[model samples]
Target: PRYLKGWLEDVVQLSLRRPSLRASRQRPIISLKERILEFNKRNNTAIIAVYKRKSPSGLDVERDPIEYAKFMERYAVGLAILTEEKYFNGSYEDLRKIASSVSIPILMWDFIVKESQIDDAYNLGADTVGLIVKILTERELESLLEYARSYGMEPAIVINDENDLDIALRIGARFIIISSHDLETLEINKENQRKLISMIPSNVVKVVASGISERNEIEELYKLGVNAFEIGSSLMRNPEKIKEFI
Candidate 1:
C-alpha cells in the first residue's frame, strides 16, 4: 500500500547513494515535440512505444529490450525507455543501446529527481526526459526542466491533475503528459482524461500515457488534441496489436 511518493523516494535515495552510469556515449539531439508534431501532421496520431522489462502494474514482458525497441520504432514516432531499475526493472543501458539504434526520439522515463540523473540521461543519449509533477516540488520541477533543457533536450512534464497543470503552465512547460494512472493509488481512470486534457493549452504538446491499450481509445483521445500516446504493457504483451495503432 505504498504510494509512488514513498516508492520513488526509496529508489531515488538508493540510486543517489550508489549512482551508476553505463559506458557513456552521445547521440544527436532530437526533439520529441517536433517528432510528435510531424506525426500529428501526417498520421494525425503519434505513438510513443515504451520499452521496459516490468512495471508496478504486475506485468512482466521478458524479451530482448533492444530488439523490441527497434521493432516498436517501425510503428511508433517516439520511444520511451523506462529506466527505473527496481520496480520497472529497466536500465540506463537500455536507453543507451536503443538510442544508438533508433532514429526516432528516445525519452528517458524514470522517477527523475536529480540534476545529476539528467546529466546521465544526456550523456547516455536521451532525447527527452520524463519529469513527474507528483514526485517533485514546483521548485525542483522548474529547476530540473531548465537543467534538462540546458543540454538541448525536451522534457515532458507529467501531470496528474489541474494543480499540477497549473505549475506546468506557470513554469512554461512546452510538452505535457497527462497520465491516466494515479501515481499514489496506481489506478487508471480513462474517463477523467478528457476533462484534464481539455485544460492544457493548445500550444503545448500533449501526450497521454498509461493504461491505454485499444485503437478506439487512441482515436477518441486524438480528437481531443493529444499529440502522442505512450503505450507499454499492451504492446509488449500483444505486439501484433501495433498494427491497430500504426
Candidate 2:
C-alpha cells in the first residue's frame, strides 16, 4: 500500500507536466454568464453580456491587459472574453490571466474547431467555451462538448434559428446564445424577433447576442424574454455606458 501511494504520486507529477495527460484530466464548471442567465431565467432579471475588444491595429494585448481586465471586473457585468481576432476582438493568454485575476466566470469565445484548443483553454483556466452551430456537425458538436465536459468546461452553443436550437439541444448544450441578427436581416422587425424567441424551448437559458447596444435594444430584448444579451461592438465603442444597461 505504501509503494502504491508512491507510484500514484509519481504518476500525478508526470501527468501534470505532460500536456496530453493534462488535457485528458480537465472537467467542466458553470460559467458566470451561465449562472447569471440561469438566475435571470428564474427571476426574470435582465443580464448584460460584456464582450471585450482587441485594439484597432490587431496587435496582441495592446496597452495593459490587466487594466482592461480590472475595468471589466469592477463593472459587475456578465463577461464573455472574446478570443477570436477575426470576428470580434480578444487574446487567449490575456483573457486567461484576466479570468484568473478577477476570479469571475468568463466564457472563452473563439472559433473552436480543434480539440487541442479546448485543452489549451482549460490549461489557461477558462470555465466556459463557445461553439457556433453553423460550423459543426451534430457528431462533432457532441464530441467537442464531451471533451469540454471532461475538462470541467461548459459548452455554450450559439444559435441563429430553430434548427440550430434543435442541434444544440440534441447535443446536450444547456447554455444557448441567440442573436437578433439571426431573426431578420439588417431591416429587422419586432414581430419576427418575438417569434424567434417564442420558438426557443423554455428549459434552456437563452442568451441574446450580437447587435445589442443602446438602451432601447436592451429594453426590447428584455421584453422579448431574453435572459442575457451579448454586446460586442456596442460595448467596445462605448465602454462607459455599461453601467446604465447592467
Candidate 3:
C-alpha cells in the first residue's frame, strides 16, 4: 500500500539523523534462537512478547515499558521492543531501558532499512534485529543480514509471502519470523500465514508473529512445529492475561 510505503519512507528519513551514543554497559548478550529453543524444549511453547505504545493500526498500548518488560522477562523466553519513533511511538530509550531491566534476549523491532540502524541497535544493547523483506530489495536484505551478524547479533527476517521466504532461505537465515499482518492493508491473514509456515523446513528456527492472542492458536501452531510466537497488542491491552500464553 502507498501508506505503508510512505511510512517506511518517513522512518528512513528519520533514521538518517543517526543515533547518539550512550555510556557503555556490560551485560552478556543473549541469543534469541538459543532462548526460544531452550523454552520450546522444556515447555513445548515459546513466546517473544513485544512492547509498543502505539501503531498506525490505531492500537494504543498504554503501559510503563520498563515494568512491563520486567513482567514479561519472568515468563517469556525473549522480548521484542519496537524502536521506531514515528508510526509506532517507539523509542531507543525503551530499548535501552528494557535491555538493562531484563536478562532475556531483546529484539530491536523496527523498520531497519539501513545497516547503520543495526549498529545503533547493537550499541543500545539489542540481542537481535528485525529485517522486513517487503521493504528491502534482495541485495539489501542479504547485506543487512550479513552486517548485523558482523556484530554477533542474530537478525530475524520478517516475511509475509513466498518471495520473502525464498530470500530468507537463500541468505541462510537462522531465524525466520512469519507475521500475519499485511503491510499494505495493515490487516492480518491467518490463511496466508499458514501457507508460508508450512513451506519452511524444520531446521530453521520459525517464529510466528502478529495477530496471535489465544493459547489455542499457539498450541495448534506448535503442533505444526513452529519454534516460537511473538505477540504484542493483546498482552499490552491486558498484562495479567499473559499467564494464558505462558
Candidate 4:
C-alpha cells in the first residue's frame, strides 16, 4: 500500500495554486459558478443520489433511468449517481445514461480501484469521480487525482481527518467532500469536525454529506464554511427544489 501510494503520488498533480476564472470556450470544465453563487445566496446544498428506485419498499412512481433522467432535466445542478453495482444497486451501464441525459455535473461515486474505472468515468461523459481518502493510499489518492486532471475531469475528494485533509491539500482539488462515516460510527468528540472543516481552504468547494439529521446540523456545518451540503434524498427533492432555493 505504501509503495502503491508512493507510485501514485509520483504522477499526481503537485501544484496547489488557486484556479483562475474562465468561460466554456476557454476550458473543458463545466464551471460551478452558477451553483456556487446559488449556494452562496441560499446557504444550502445536497449531493443528489442516483440509486435506481428499488428494494423492500417500492417505487410505483419511479423508473430506473427515466426518473433519474427526469431529475437531470429539471434540477441537476449537483448529482452523484451510484455506479458500484454490487453495493449501491447500480452499475457502469447506468452511468452512461445519466451522463447522456443530464446537463449538470455528475460525481461518478464508486469504490474505484483500477484505472479502467477512471477511464469509464470521463468516457461515459461524467464530470468527476469520487475519491475518498479512506478508500485509497496517499499515493493512490494523489495519483488518481492527477490521472483525472490529466484528461481535465475533476475529482470530488472525500476527507476524514488530518491525513485525508493533508492529502487533499497537497494537490489542487477544486471540490472536496467531507466524509462523516467515521464520525457517526465512532465515539469521538464532534468538536473536531468543525476544526477539520476549518482546515480546508475557502477557495475549494467544500461539501459535507450523510449523518445530518435536522436543520441545526446543517446550520452548524454552514457556520464552519462548508459551501455545499450532501443529502441522501428521496425522489421528492425534485427540480423544483433547485428553483425554489437557488
Best candidate according to TM-score: 3
Stretches of candidate 1 exceeding 4 Å from the true structure: 1-6, 18-24
TM per prediction: 0.93, 0.73, 0.94, 0.71
How would you encode candidate 4's per-residue C-alpha lDDT over 75-151 as one tens digit per residue? 54567766654323566666666665667666777656546667766676667778777656777877888898786
Stretches off by above 4 angstroms in model 4 are 1-63, 183-191, 213-216, 233-246
Worst 10 residues of 3 by lDDT: 1-10
For model 2, name the residue pairs that clash: 26-150, 26-151, 27-151, 27-152, 27-153, 28-152, 28-153, 29-152
Please write out the lDDT profile of model 1 over residues 1-246, one tens digit for every residue: 113456666776656553656545555888998998987778655888888788776888888877887787788888888888899888777887888887888888887878778888888888879988877778888898999888898899999889989999999999999987877667887767778898989999998886787789888877888888888888888766788876
RMSD of each: 2.3, 11.2, 2.1, 8.5
| Candidate 4 whole-model C-alpha lDDT, 0 to 1 | 0.60
Model 4, TM vs. native: 0.71
For candidate 4, give the lDDT of residue 192.
Answer: 58
Prediction-by-prediction clash tally: 0, 8, 0, 1
* lDDT for position 196 in model 2: 66
Worst 10 residues of 2 by lDDT: 1-10
Could you tell me which residue pairs clash in candidate 4? 5-139
